[PDB]
Amino acid sequence: LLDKKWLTFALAIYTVFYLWVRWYEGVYGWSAGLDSFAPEFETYWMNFLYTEIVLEIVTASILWGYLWKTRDRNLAALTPREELRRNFTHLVWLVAYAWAIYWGASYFTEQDGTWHQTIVRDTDFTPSHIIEFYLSYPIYIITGFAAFIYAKTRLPFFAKGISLPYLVLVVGPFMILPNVGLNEWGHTFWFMEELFVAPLHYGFVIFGWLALAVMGTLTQTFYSFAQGGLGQSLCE
């Protein structure tokens, strides 16, 4: 069996959900979403913010708790074939993390750019901010934490210790979410110019760099893949 169709679901769920989110923000961007003090803004974007925050907290708790509770206690008695299957599942988790990272840190971030350069931002919770800071960022954070936990709890290579590159890849992009405090603070106060390259935005930049730890993470996963079932063929 090895690599199964969980990868198709991993791609499709993010693609479909974010396409629907884009449709929603295209429909309610203007017209209930321009005026932050209008009653329709509360029903179409503040309610969205509340619901998405509650659902993200619940989903993160449930997913992480399930992954930690179903952790493999007897990692020693794991066959190489099962280890290969678990390595493929972890690679599917990493693919989902990469897809979520794309959607969060490229699509909706530059969408925040094109929203703020063309409207006068009315609050810290513009529809763009609700979608990007509080939906896509938590979603990719949840996916990254889940992938890290799966590696630690199913892969003997990633067990017996916390991998530094994986921890950086998982936590640095997470630090972008608390960095929103710098975004709002240096915008209301420091810098009223919409300048997307303003130093108030270098918090995203610095912690966006930590995603480069995916390189060490991926060579670690390559070594984990090539533990018992490394071949032969490769180097033979």
Partner 1 sequence: HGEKSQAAFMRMRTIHWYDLSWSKEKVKINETVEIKGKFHVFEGWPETVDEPDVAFLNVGMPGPVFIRKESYIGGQLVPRSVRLEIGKTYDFRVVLKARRPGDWHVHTMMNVQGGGPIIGPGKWITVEGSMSEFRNPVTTLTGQTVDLENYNEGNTYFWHAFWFAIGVAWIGYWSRRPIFIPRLLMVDAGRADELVSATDRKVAMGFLAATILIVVMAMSSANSKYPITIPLQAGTMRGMKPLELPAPTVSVKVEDATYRVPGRAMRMKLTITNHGNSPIRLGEFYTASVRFLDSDVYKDTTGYPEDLLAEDGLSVSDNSPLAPGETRTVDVTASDAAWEVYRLSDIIYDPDSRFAGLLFFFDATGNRQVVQIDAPLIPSFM
Ligand X SMILES: CCCCCC(=O)OC[C@H](COP(=O)(O)OCC[N+](C)(C)C)OC(=O)CCCCC
Ligand Y SMILES: CCCCCCCCCCCC(=O)OC[C@H](COP(=O)(O)OCC[N+](C)(C)C)OC(=O)CCCCCCCCCCC
Residue ranges in 25-84 that form contacts with ligand Y under rule CB under 6 A:
44, 47-48, 51-53, 55-56, 59
Q: Given candidates 20, 30, 68, 185, which one binds ligand P1O under the rule CB under 6 A? A: 68
Q: Given candidates 24, 71, 121, 177, which one binds partner 1 under the rule CB under 8 A? A: 121
Angstrom distance (rounded) from CA 99 to CA 211: 13
Residue ranges in 167-226 that form contacts with ligand Y under rule CB under 6 A:
182, 189-192, 202-203
DSSP 200: G
* 226 part of the interface to partner 1, by CB under 8 A: yes
Q: Given candidates 96, 101, 130, 200, which one binds ligand P1O under the rule CB under 6 A? A: 96
Tokens for 156, please give them. 């003997």
Q: Known binder of ligand: residue 90?
A: no
Residue ranges in 150-179 that form contacts with ligand P1O under rule CB under 6 A:
152, 154, 162, 171
CA distances from 54 to 12, 51, 158, 180, 193 (A): 23, 5, 31, 19, 33
Angstrom distance (rounded) from CA 126 to CA 195: 17
Instruction: Give the amino acid at 200.
Output: L
Is the CB of 83 or the CB of 200 nearer to ligand P1O?
83
* 11 part of the interface to partner 1, by CB under 8 A: no
For every residue of 136-167, DSSP letters joined together read: IHHHHHHHHHHHHHHHHHH-TTTSSS--HHHH
195: CB partners within 8 A, 6+ apart = none
Q: Given candidates 119, 159, 171, 182, which one binds partner 1 under the rule CB under 8 A? A: 119
Is the CB of 47 or the CB of 106 nearer to ligand X?
106
